[PDB]
Design a protein around this ligand. Structure first.
Ligand SMILES: CCOC(=O)N(C)Cc1c(C(=O)O)n(Cc2cccc3ccccc23)c2ccc(F)cc12
Ligand SMILES: [Zn+2]
Length: 226
């Protein structure tokens, strides 16, 4: 998160920290959020050989009683996910066991309404990602408020599409989601409407988020069968 503030500890108890293994390099990290006691929603580009999820964290370098370090048994990547265009960048992780409910850990379910969210309003995003181009991932959970932009503002991303994706962050400001914030939720008035997907290496906003409304049938289909 660039240009944001430190979150009040444990104020977003659905937030998930992901550590992803691949066979030929060191660990990488993403965000995510718990929508059922045994399911986390994140981005498909965060997939790997194996993944561990930490719930209940604020400072990720200091172990505490609120932590729940949970095993993932299966990864469900969207079947049409495209590694070139990055269309359909969404994934569900099934946890081996259900998480415990505490003050620091709980689910964020969707409302029944599935309406399209137009440009103009302010929303909020959170994560442990880098706080600058030459800076490291934050030790504490950070957050920032950003504007939903007209789709023309993301035209330069040649594979962007308005009906699949949100365009997030005023280009006149530095505020933005960045590397390490992948898979985290964008909340508009307390409802999750987007998922951090990608942007520019130099951090100039806006960035591109998956539009959740469009994938609601697929999400329901996975959860019902599992
Ligand atoms: C297990 C594999 O995991 C990885 O390979 N990971 C986690 C690296 C990775 C990241 C990241 O570091 O978070 N982002 C987001 C991203 C990248 C670049 C610029 C951005 C500006 C704004 C927001 C987000 C931006 C990706 C997008 C597509 C992609 F294929 C890979 C990545
Ligand atoms: Zn604590």
């Amino acid at each position: 998160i660039i240009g944001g503030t430190e979150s009040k500890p444990h104020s977003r108890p659905y937030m998930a920290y992901l550590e992803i293994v691949t066979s030929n390099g060191p660990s990488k990290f993403c965000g995510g959020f718990l929508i059922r006691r045994n399911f986390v929603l994140t981005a498909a580009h965060c997939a790997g050989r194996s993944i561990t999820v930490t719930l209940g964290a604020h400072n990720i370098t200091e172990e505490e009683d609120t932590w729940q370090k949970l095993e993932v048994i299966k990864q469900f990547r969207h079947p049409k996910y495209n590694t070139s265009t990055l269309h359909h960048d969404i994934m569900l992780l099934k946890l081996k066991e259900k998480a415990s409910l505490t003050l620091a850990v709980g689910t964020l379910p969707f409302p029944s309404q599935k309406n399209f969210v137009p440009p103009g309003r302010m929303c909020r995003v959170a994560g442990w990602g880098r706080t600058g181009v030459l800076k490291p991932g934050s030790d504490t959970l950070q957050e920032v408020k950003l504007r939903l932009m007209d789709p023309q503002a993301c035209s330069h991303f040649r594979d962007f599409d308005h009906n699949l994706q949100l365009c997030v962050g005023n280009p006149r400001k530095t505020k933005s989601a960045f590397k390490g914030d992948s898979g985290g939720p964008l909340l508009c008035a307390g409802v999750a409407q987007g998922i951090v997907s990608y942007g520019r290496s130099d951090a100039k906003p806006p960035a591109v988020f998956t539009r959740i409304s469009h994938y609601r049938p697929w999400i329901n289909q996975i959860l019902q069968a599992n």
